[model samples]
Target: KLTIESTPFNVAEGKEVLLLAHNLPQNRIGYSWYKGERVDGNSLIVGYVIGTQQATPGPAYSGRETIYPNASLLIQNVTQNDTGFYTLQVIKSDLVNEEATGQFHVY
Candidate 1:
């Protein structure tokens, strides 16, 4: 299982917010972030971070998202359209997949 912590209030438009993944299992090879209710091929991926490596932002995120080594997600220039649920998926070397979800509002 996965655990996460994030801001519990709404963020103003043009602001920023951080969604942190806590208790992520060790030896994780990579992490993927998605926006909306699902984390799948059809979801809007925010970004993907490789263990101790560089991160790639999805098309929609382009230059507005960042992923930290701990799999924390930082989103800049929040907009009303950004209000929604987000999910994170961790790829562990031990073959145990883990995921967590959080929600935030943009106003």
Candidate 2:
């Protein structure tokens, strides 16, 4: 099963955290991250296509959000108000979709 892991599992204010993905299927085409449980554009933080070398941000995108090549969503300068759930949507090479959710807490 796909799963999300918050690096360190705890963070302090003004720091960064990595919401890492694991057990992902092999033929992943790309992935998108939402700031909350909603997977719509309004909550989308970033969308990254493999080999693009960059991530596309959406309406909820904060300057600290970034998508790493390893398919992890890294958020920098996290604040206490940033504490909440996050969503990840992954698209396979054949165009099928997979998803997972993780909660992050900022102290």
Candidate 3:
């Protein structure tokens, strides 16, 4: 099972927030971020990190996002449209799978 942590509050418009995943085991091969509640299937990809390289912004986050070592997602310039559930999928070096989900609100 994957453990995650997220800020559960309504962020004012124009603010920024970070949705974090916690207690991830070491040696992660990749990480994926998504917008909305479904992580198992085809959820919208927001951003992702491959190996130890920098994160690649997905269609939804073009140039306004970042992913941290712990697989935390940082979204800048929050707006009402940003309100929704976010999910993360972790890919380990051993090729096992773990996932997590969280919600956010923008006012």
Candidate 4:
């Protein structure tokens, strides 16, 4: 299982929030931060977290989001629109998989 935490867990609205994930498999092809349903299998928003190359933000995430290694997804100027559940998809090199979910709440 993976461990997830928010740096400075409590913060004012419109502030930057950093999300961190641990215990992730080492052979990850890509890391995704999505704010939508996975059971029904519809992804609303998604971004890539790459180690060497720059992560390309989805059109929905452009201008206000950033993701990096260590599985951190940074949301700039948090708003109600930024609140939701983020699911991480880890694709192993052997074609195996692991998933983790964490909720983002804005106060």
Estimate every model's Cα lDDT from 0 to 1: 0.77, 0.86, 0.73, 0.66
Model 3 deviation from native, Cα RMSD in Å: 2.3
Candidate closest to the true structure, highest lDDT: 2
RMSD of each predicted structure: 2.0, 1.2, 2.3, 2.6
The 10-residue segment of model 3 with minimum total lDDT is: 40-49
Better of 1 and 3 by lDDT: 1
TM-score, prediction 1 = 0.85
**1-107, model 2: which lDDT tens digit per residue?**
88899985789999999999998889988888988775777888889988666678888887888888778988999999889999899889887888999888899
Give the TM-score of each candidate.
Answer: 0.85, 0.92, 0.82, 0.77
Residue pairs with backbone overlap in model 3 = none
Candidate 1, residue 85: lDDT: 85
User: Could you tell which candidate, 1 or 4, scores higher by lDDT?
Assistant: 1
Clashes of each: 0, 0, 0, 0
What tens-digit string does per-residue lDDT give for candidate 4 at 1-107?
A: 87667665665688987878889887877676766535222452454645454565554664666777667778778887666666666656676777777666777
Best by TM-score: 2
- After TM-score superposition, the amount by which residue 73's alpha carbon in candidate 4 deviates from its true location, in angstroms, is 0.5
Q: Pick the winner on lDDT between candidates 3 and 4.
A: 3
Q: Candidate 2 at 87: error in angstroms?
A: 0.6
Residue runs of model 2 more than 4 Å from their true location after superposition:
none
* lDDT (Cα, tens digit) per residue for candidate 3, span 40-71: 43554554556547566655564567787768
